[PDB]
Design a protein around this ligand. Structure first.
Ligand code: F43
Ligand code: F43
Ligand SMILES: C[C@@H](OP(=O)(O)O)[C@H](NC(=O)CCCCCCS)C(=O)O
Ligand SMILES: O=S(=O)(O)CCS
Ligand SMILES: O=S(=O)(O)CCS
Ligand SMILES: [Cl-]
Ligand SMILES: [Cl-]
Ligand SMILES: [K+]
Ligand SMILES: [Mg+2]
Ligand SMILES: [Mg+2]
Ligand SMILES: [Mg+2]
Ligand SMILES: [Mg+2]
Ligand SMILES: [Mg+2]
Ligand SMILES: [Mg+2]
Ligand SMILES: [Mg+2]
Ligand SMILES: [Mg+2]
Ligand SMILES: [Mg+2]
Ligand SMILES: [Mg+2]
Ligand SMILES: [Mg+2]
Ligand SMILES: [Mg+2]
Ligand code: NA
Ligand code: NA
Lengths: 548, 442, 248, 548, 56
């Protein structure tokens, strides 16, 4: 069959993908592009309106001496210019981040114990349902106790709510289903049983604060906002004194003792509070992505949906804006979720492994790493050599490094069932690639790459960690594009091959199994395409409170 | 020598130990037992071997509810604890007869570790204690069972948690009384970021010993912060002596006189009487049926008032056997005594202010929690320069079981290990003995 | 003890509330059962719940401070800590928020008192709270028009009075009945209806409110005219200011 | 003349303002209110659409047993229900914060030295103009060097730009005026001369990154985004190699050596990066507010415009959302910028001072503090006693404490010309108030209040600081409403009385003297009113990239 | 001035911040005392020595 990227290459260029030569310099520069033409016109209008020059195609060098390509969003039939995949221009991408940033998971286990010991009152599905009615009024920013309170406009905060989940089916089934993330409905039977066993009789809230608030403020707002309105709702629903010593136990529980942040705070040089992208460990990112519960018969699809999730968040929004900015890093990320390229390479590796070892049946050792990662690296690089159009597509060495090594590392983990040998395969891929083409990535691409092999299996203080626990603040990883989202994929890969319901945190997995989210985490690449087409409807907009 | 003041020192039963001890014999800068306590707290680590073993067996590593399916490792760590601890000790020590201590507790489920003092002599700070201990136990476990290169990173995760992806040792199975240097509210604050429940746990809820340990840590921090330099030094030393070391048996005697039927108000009346009797305050002016008191020694008035504040906490929270009202005592002892006398309250209002916010943040939705989770580095309770938190330690020592976030809940690992150390458990004894020993060298 | 400076009736009343030797004037009789109903923590005839075992059943080590401090009866028993909370009108209620907290820590043992503008609370062991609450409800700490027992929804201290002279209550826990001229408590302090209301007596008349109040106002006794009280407040400001600078 | 709050009180209530009695419980609860009625209907619609209950007026206690009041925005004729002053419901308030968050000041002094030395090229007004044309193309997110770059949509980022200023008139006049903040045009003559003397021959950029980016990301993004596009524009405009050793000097200069953040980062318990509200010192907040350059003949107006700026930002957005959330703290803040109440009290105090001492002519000592703060405190408290409608308006003791003490503190600083004695007057006011009414604020209001007197003149490590340098991270101030914005006012007060052009940083003052901002910093209260009326047009919306 | 803070202060310290903090307050106090700087003005000496700390 055709390689999976052939359709996309045929769309981009008039030549067949194998053809070695082309002609340049005859396309009219920016004038070849619908999107650049839109931008030129908009820049003229903006400059006139505000009295300050802005976008101008004659500044600096003239874009479009070559073909300015469309990109296929992988697993879709949507083709768009890359500008439509810039996070600034793509409301789906923005909302994906808002939906993570504005979520916290907050236990009710200590709270219910405070109610039963300290105050000496009882808890049942009925009292929990009443509490959930109460907190779903309060959480978006509405009052339950004081006189003369002023409140948020319900329509501006329609995306904020609280649901619960529990492994106790009898309780889950008796709470009003409007408020319940139903594990048995959302997960296939095997995964549901795993998840219910992890949660047991615990009861957990999934709290989503308003997008408009998250955008006005920051990620570290989320658990505080959550806790204030949990606290008010505990007071109201359980007929508590409105501010007694016991009130502080609910605060401490909701803010600290039974809160799960999406991200942990960062060191000063990159100072940030909780629920910012750099604090989200790779295992959580894989668990946030919901491909695992829909596409479980296809571990490649699950792994590469995680890669898309992470490449966009970590390279485009995090590294490309929080940590830098400007034009940024769209195509460093799109390389990992367009043109079905990473898909072609990773399906090759999965077949190699399935045929030679069987998934998860290879020895978890360096022999397997050497075999699988080398074989898959050579396959990927051969494709760039055989298809000149492919090489011109993924024109930056970093993009190619990330794609080839992601396939090699995921394939290694498919073989071993262990993410750490997957990670070793990623680094070996880089070393082989560098020697094959006498190049790898940008100036600073392989900082982590060269520290990489030695730090895979280290046990030292700031070196040793299972991959699932690593993230954007792992020291070697803290700076550079073309790695973090791919590592989230490698973290997912062995778990997808094993059929595991989660990678690192079962509560995080369940917390995004929710169609009341604005973004559809089951189909990340489909959502990116919808946003590119300007068809995605985000939360948080101010139209209701601004003029016509 | 710098100061002329002398104090009489007692044991925690109210019996005289040594009269006429120069004030500076109690200084953190001079007293060798305070030095030993502070260096001991820098260097001591609790290792939960059982916890490490269980985290490994279940692959539950990296923080609350986290787990990595397929990574489970079943190692007989507790059953081989003697060997593992001995191997770790070899790596932790600098030389074979130094002050390294590694002692098994609980049938090998726990280890007390005291990292040698020499490592801190050539360190900037205190993190060598958890970091040297952690790697020595990670390596010792790996070596005990010949854990492979492929699996050893799980041992590391079980011991030290999600660090360095997290800034903290998130999910670790070691514990210290100190917390990481990045969490300091200000430079110089590390001896303040010690949970009140940890102090109560280490001193086995002995009220005077808990107050003494807390005061030693707080006032030693005031030296590290520079607050007790120059003009303020004597105020801080008198506060250490009278509020935390029961100087002149003043705290003890106020509690004795007010314990049966007394209140915060009755303690205030006795303290004002005692200050007047001792010449610390004097009537300055007569208003209409109201005496305005003055003082020629503000630092000594402050110290007497601080002793009364401690006694008032002991009487009020001791009578309730419930710690929560310490926030109220800290507020209204100070508020009442100002309108009783015309003199400024303890720490010139800063205890009262601390108490206002502490009350709020222990009775509201916004933050804080119960008294035991506060500390001198907490944003709510940092404001008074050592005169508030020791009262909170006393109150929590006196709590009979009204708190959800009790020392039993928050501090069990700390309790088992740190209470083994005599100078941590009974600091008032050792500091008073050291002061008596050096009394003629001041 | 002195308690408070000043030469006004306000100042004297503030002193009297703090002074445990001053006999609080009893204005109304309330049954033990009705105090329990007003509090709303347990039903009459219900055993005191516990938060921990009786102190006697515990095996506590030697501690000189514990030995010297007699526990309150509810601590001995292991009672829960519960509360009573009052709101006082700025239109000359007899007690006021700091007056209460100051007085409570002079008069009562084992007390957690909190002051706010619109509410003032005491938390202590339940059986002891019931005894204290009787005194807080029966005496001149309380007027049934200008004070309210309120565990939530406290708004009203700063509001205009209604046509009956009653403070605002969002939850209408205290109802003035014209036919007796008396106020009845029809809900407990958290706002749940009582099966049978509790007589709280007649509101104090204007003259008596002015005799008993502890708030300074231009249309009563103004604080600025209690020059000795102001003098002490200014003194404390100055001495605190100097002390923070250089201990002089 | 009538007290300045009388009109507002007559609008709120049927009774005259002096009347002691009213009638309650007859207004129909929420049904009395246009806004609550809108909210009830919106909640029904939201809940029906999403399948989860939301706003419900029958949860908890029934709002509106008393009059739900309109508020006059002080200095305006606009009356709105308080919900229209909630930051969530007020796009002007949100944009005020975005315009601060997305701004940094970046010198060109080191950069031009690097150009002249290290690159050995000349800098002139002409080369600066070319650089500015280049950076105004690049800064919103557009390319100048590489082929096949994908870019931000100019119309989504129309609010991003770079201007410069310098104290050298002849140099300023030679740069293209589209790019120049003209100090002589924006400031009255004496202020302009002060500011130009502070800047001298220095040349400074004012960089504003896009609102849509700031909302997606955080404040710590700003200086990074700025620096990336300064860096690209230095490469393009001065014809550098595109990535040589000298490139790193421009990065270090723009990111560290000559950047001025609006806010400094915060400690871990309240972890945040730069350009978040808690990091903005009070003196900067006063300088961001532009009332000083318009209303300079009226120091009360200038001071109270600063109070409005700070009460909203620090209490509503910062303490009420970043540090808590929920319904939050609208009216804790509105007390300081509505019904002309603080204005009445502060004009009383200014007139008292003018007559007794003359502005800035009182001895800077405790005698003046005792005199002025006591007199003004007693005036303000008497108004609540004289006018029962006023007391029912500012119903929370905290609100009254903040308003009375702000008047007392500002008035004291009007007398002394020194913010530190102003601050002492604020604390004395609290102490007097507490004794007068036997109440002050909420449970935790006077933590800083009771530490206050002693810490005004302290010199110890974490105690001693001039008020202008204090901010929301000063330890005693880090938690509580009803102080921070008032302190910004007190910081402004002596400087307004003295006629000073700035309070703490002249570069910050100049950097907001710019009508290309979205929010009009010259008339903060007018803008809050415009937003309340749903008449303010914010930047950052996604309408262009979402369905019609 | 070269300042070396006595080693004994670090023996009873957790870390190293006593060096700047003890030095700063000793020089702030010494300057105030040298010139009899008033209570009203001394906070400027503090700012000149140690900067915007603790707001920063
Ligand atoms: C000025 C630098 C040095 C530096 O610090 N950053 C630059 C430029 C910067 C700018 C370019 C925008 C513009 O043109 O104005 C941005 C977009 C970052 C920003 N400020 O927004 C960027 N690079 Ni660069 N940069 C990229 C890349 C690369 C590749 C391009 C190689 C090729 O053959 O074309 C090379 C490094 C390499 O050789 O491996 C590279 C270099 C460089 N990169 C050279 C300029 C190279 C030139 O003169 O043409 N980038 C890539 O390899 C792909 C992704 C791409 C990024 C944009 C996106 O992700 O969509 C962009 C990311
Ligand atoms: C439950 C608490 C304890 C606590 O931790 N926070 C509360 C409640 C909280 C909630 C109330 C929302 C709701 O009704 O659901 C919010 C809005 C914070 C949030 N979670 O969004 C808030 N307070 Ni409170 N809170 C306020 C105030 C106050 C005043 C109200 C006194 C009065 O007489 O009405 C008193 C403190 C005092 O007495 O000084 C007060 C108490 C209390 N405050 C008591 C409830 C009082 C009651 O039972 O009625 N607040 C104020 O004094 C004014 C500003 C007002 C805040 C909302 C705004 O700024 O618009 C609100 C600020
Ligand atoms: C105390 C502290 O909370 P914790 O005790 O750490 O949970 C802190 N909150 C606050 O200071 C809340 C301030 C805003 C709400 C109260 C306004 S008076 C914080 O979340 O960092
Ligand atoms: O050219 S560099 O590798 O420095 C940057 C690539 S974006
Ligand atoms: O009632 S509390 O003072 O705790 C909170 C006021 S918003
Ligand atoms: Cl309720
Ligand atoms: Cl003017
Ligand atoms: K944001
Ligand atoms: Mg074709
Ligand atoms: Mg923690
Ligand atoms: Mg959907
Ligand atoms: Mg081996
Ligand atoms: Mg006499
Ligand atoms: Mg009777
Ligand atoms: Mg008169
Ligand atoms: Mg009218
Ligand atoms: Mg319904
Ligand atoms: Mg010219
Ligand atoms: Mg212009
Ligand atoms: Mg304009
Ligand atoms: Na161009
Ligand atoms: Na309601």
């Amino acid at each position: 069959a055709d390689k999976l990227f052939i359709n996309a290459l045929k769309k981009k260029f008039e030549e067949s993908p194998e053809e070695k030569k082309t002609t340049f310099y005859t396309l009219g520069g920016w004038k070849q592009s619908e999107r650049k033409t839109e931008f030129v016109n908009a820049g003229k209008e903006v400059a006139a309106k505000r009295g300050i020059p802005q976008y101008n195609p004659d500044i600096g060098t003239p874009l479009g001496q070559r073909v300015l390509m469309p990109y296929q969003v992988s697993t879709t039939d949507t083709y768009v210019e890359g500008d439509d995949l810039h996070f600034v221009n793509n409301a789906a991408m923005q909302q994906m981040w808002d939906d993570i940033r504005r979520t916290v998971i907050v236990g009710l286990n200590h709270a219910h114990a405070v109610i039963e010991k300290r105050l000496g009152k009882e808890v049942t599905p009925e009292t929990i349902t009443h509490y959930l009615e109460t907190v779903n009024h309060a959480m978006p920013g509405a009052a339950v106790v004081q006189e003369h309170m002023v409140e948020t406009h319900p329509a501006l905060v329609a995306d904020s709510y609280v649901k619960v989940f529990t492994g106790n089916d009898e309780i889950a089934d008796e709470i009003d289903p409007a408020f319940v993330i139903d594990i048995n409905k959302q997960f296939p039977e095997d995964q549901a049983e795993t998840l219910k066993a992890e949660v047991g009789d615990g009861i957990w809230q999934v709290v989503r604060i308003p997008t408009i608030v998250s955008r006005t403020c920051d990620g570290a707002t989320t658990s505080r906002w959550s806790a204030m309105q949990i606290g008010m709702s505990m007071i109201s629903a359980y007929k508590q004194a409105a501010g007694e010593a016991a009130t502080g136990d609910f605060a401490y529980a909701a803010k600290h003792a039974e809160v799960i942040h999406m991200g942990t705070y960062l060191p000063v040089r990159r100072a940030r509070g909780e629920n910012e992208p750099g604090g989200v460990p790779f295992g959580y990112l894989a668990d946030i992505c919901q491909s695992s519960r829909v596409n479980y018969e296809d571990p490649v699809r699950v792994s590469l949906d995680v890669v898309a999730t992470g490449a966009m968040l970590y390279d485009q929004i995090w590294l490309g804006s929080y940590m830098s900015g400007g034009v940024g890093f769209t195509q460093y990320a799109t390389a990992a979720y367009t043109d079905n390229i990473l898909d072609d390479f990773t399906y090759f590796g999965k077949e190699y492994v399935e045929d030679k070892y069987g998934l998860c049946e290879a020895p978890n050792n360096m022999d397997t790493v050497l075999d699988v990662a080398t074989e898959v690296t050579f396959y990927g690089l051969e494709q760039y050599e055989e298809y000149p159009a492919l090489l011109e597509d993924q024109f930056g060495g970093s993009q190619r490094a990330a794609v080839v090594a992601a396939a090699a590392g995921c394939s290694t983990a498919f073989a071993t069932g262990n993410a750490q040998t997957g990670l070793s395969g990623w680094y070996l891929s880089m070393y082989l690639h560098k020697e094959q083409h006498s190049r790898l990535g940008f100036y600073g691409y392989d900082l982590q790459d060269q520290c990489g092999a030695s730090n895979v299996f280290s046990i030292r203080g700031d070196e040793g960690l299972p991959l699932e626990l690593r993230g954007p603040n792992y020291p070697n990883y803290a700076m550079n594009v073309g790695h973090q989202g791919e590592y989230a994929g490698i973290s997912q890969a062995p778990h997808a091959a094993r059929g595991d319901a989660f990678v690192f945190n079962p509560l995080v997995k369940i917390a995004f199994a929710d169609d009341n989210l604005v973004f559809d985490f089951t189909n990340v690449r489909g959502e990116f395409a919808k946003g590119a087409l300007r068809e995605f409807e985000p939360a948080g907009e101010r139209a209701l409170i601004t003029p016509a | 020598a710098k100061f002329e003041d002398k104090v009489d020192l007692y044991d925690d039963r109210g019996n005289l130990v040594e009269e006429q001890v120069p004030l500076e014999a109690l200084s953190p800068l001079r007293n060798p037992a305070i030095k030993s306590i502070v260096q001991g707290i820098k260097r001591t680590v609790a290792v939960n071997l059982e916890g490490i073993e269980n985290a490994l067996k279940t692959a539950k590593v990296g923080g609350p509810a986290c787990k990595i399916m397929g990574r489970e490792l079943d190692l007989d760590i507790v059953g081989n604890a003697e060997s593992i601890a001995a191997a770790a000790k070899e790596m932790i020590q600098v030389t074979e007869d130094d002050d390294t201590n590694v002692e098994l507790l609980g049938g090998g489920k726990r280890a007390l570790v005291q990292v040698p003092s020499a490592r801190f002599d050539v360190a900037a700070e205190y993190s060598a204690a958890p970091l040297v201990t952690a790697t020595a136990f990670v390596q010792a476990i790996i070596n005990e069972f010949d854990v492979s290169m492929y699996d050893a990173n799980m041992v590391k995760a079980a011991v030290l948690g999600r660090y360095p992806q997290s800034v903290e040792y998130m999910g670790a199975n070691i514990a210290t009384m100190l917390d990481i240097p990045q969490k300091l509210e200000g430079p110089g604050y590390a001896l303040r970021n010690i949970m009140v429940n940890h102090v109560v746990a280490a001193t086995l809820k002995n009220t005077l010993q808990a107050a003494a340990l807390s005061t030693i840590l707080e006032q030693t921090a005031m030296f590290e912060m520079g607050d007790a330099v120059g003009a303020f030094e004597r105020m801080h030393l008198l506060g250490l002596a009278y509020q935390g070391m029961n100087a002149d048996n003043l705290v003890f005697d106020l509690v004795k006189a007010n314990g049966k039927e007394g209140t915060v108000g009755s303690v205030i009346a006795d303290l004002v009487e005692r200050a007047l009797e001792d010449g610390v305050i004097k009537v300055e002016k007569e208003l209409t049926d109201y005496k305005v008191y003055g003082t020629d020694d503000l630092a000594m008035w402050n110290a007497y008032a601080a002793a009364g504040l401690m006694a008032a906490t002991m009487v009020n929270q001791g009578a309730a056997r419930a710690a929560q009202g310490v926030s109220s005592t800290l507020l209204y002892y100070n508020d009442l005594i100002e309108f009783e006398t015309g003199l400024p309250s303890v720490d010139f209002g800063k205890v009262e202010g601390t108490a206002v916010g502490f009350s709020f943040f222990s009775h509201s939705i916004y933050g804080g929690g119960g008294p035991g989770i506060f500390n001198g580095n907490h944003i709510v309770t940092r404001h008074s320069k050592g005169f508030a938190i020791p009262c909170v330690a006393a109150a929590m020592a006196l709590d009979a079981g009204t708190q959800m976030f009790s020392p039993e809940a928050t501090s069990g690992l700390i309790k088992e290990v740190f209470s083994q150390v005599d100078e941590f458990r009974e600091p008032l004894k050792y500091v008073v003995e050291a002061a008596a020993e050096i009394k003629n060298e001041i | 003890a002195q308690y408070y400076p000043g030469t006004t009736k306000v100042a004297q009343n503030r002193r009297n509330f703090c002074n445990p030797e001053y006999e609080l004037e009893k204005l109304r009789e309330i049954s033990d059962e009705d105090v329990v109903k007003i509090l709303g923590h347990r039903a009459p005839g219900e055993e005191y719940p516990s938060v921990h075992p009786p102190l006697e059943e515990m095996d506590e080590p030697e501690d000189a401070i514990r030995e010297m401090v007699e526990p309150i009866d509810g601590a001995k028993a292991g009672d829960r800590v519960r509360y009573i909370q009052f709101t006082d009108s700025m239109y000359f209620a007899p007690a006021q928020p700091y007056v209460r907290s100051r007085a409570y820590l002079c008069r009562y043992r084992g007390a957690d008192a909190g002051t706010l503008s619109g509410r003032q609370i005491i938390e202590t062991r339940e059986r002891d709270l019931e005894k204290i609450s009787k005194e807080l409800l029966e005496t001149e700490f309380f007027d049934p028009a200008r004070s309210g027992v309120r565990g939530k929804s406290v708004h009203g201290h700063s509001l205009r009075l209604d046509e009956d002279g009653m403070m605002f209550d969002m939850l209408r826990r205290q109802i003035y009945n014209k036919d007796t001229g008396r106020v009845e408590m029809v809900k407990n302090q958290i706002g749940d209806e009582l099966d049978e209301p509790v007589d709280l007596g007649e509101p104090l008349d204007e003259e008596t409110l002015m005799e008993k109040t502890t708030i300074y106002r231009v249309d009563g006794e103004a604080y600025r005219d209690d020059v000795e009280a102001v003098e002490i407040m200014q003194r404390i400001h100055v001495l605190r200011s100097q002390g923070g600078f250089n201990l002089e």
